[PDB]
Amino acid sequence: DAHSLRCNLTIKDPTPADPLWYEAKCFVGEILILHLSNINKTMTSGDPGETANATEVKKCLTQPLKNLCQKLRNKVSNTKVDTHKTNGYPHLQVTMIYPQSQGRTPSATWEFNISDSYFFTFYTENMSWRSANDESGVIMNKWKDDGEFVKQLKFLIHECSQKMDEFLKQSKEK
């Protein structure tokens, strides 16, 4: 039994109606860790905010994640779909699921959801891709063919591997 550290990236198009062009949240069960976006600063607490190992994982993930959203914001605008554009238009949904590795070499699964229409996944374990159908596998093959973008996916994991494992051990344990 357990939990995995789950991060959720949301890349949309700006819109002075909803400017935020990217947002990410990583939780382990219910415990929030990270919450980024392109908006602004403050820093609020209600009781949590620290749990020391979270500030550790928080520090590790922040940039690699930020660069990923940056990557994906272009990866998506560059992409052709079936929908009619107005001034851009895509809506991406990414979800990395990192389970506790006691298990051999740290692995995660990155899930992509484009416009709620296209779905495909990346498995860090055996460096593989799966698509929901051939309509989705089309985009997938364009993306998987992007070396830097794939690297970012594996490296994000290789990098914050240990710190996420440590946070997972201490987590859900008081």
39 phi, psi to nearest 5 deg: -70, -120
Backbone torsion region of residue 127, taken as left when φ is above 0, otherwise alpha when ψ lies between -120 and 50, otherwise beta: left
**Residue 82: how many CB atoms within 10 A of its CB?**
8
**Residue 169: how many CB atoms within 10 A of its CB?**
13
**Residue 27 is encoded by which pair of tokens?**
């939780």
* Distance (Å, whole) CA 73 – CA 38: 12
Residue span of the structural domain in which 67 resides:
1-174
Q: Identify the CA nearest to 24 among candidates 4, 40, 6, 42.
A: 6
45-53 long-range contacts, Cβ below 8 Å, gap at least 24? 51/167, 51/170, 51/171, 53/163, 53/166, 53/167, 53/170, 53/171
For residues 90-116, one letter each, b for 16 or more C-beta atoms within 10 angstroms of the residue's C-beta and e for the rest, the string is bebbbbbebbbbeeeebbbbbbbbbee
CATH number, domain at 47?
3.30.500.10
Number of compact structural domains in the chain = 1
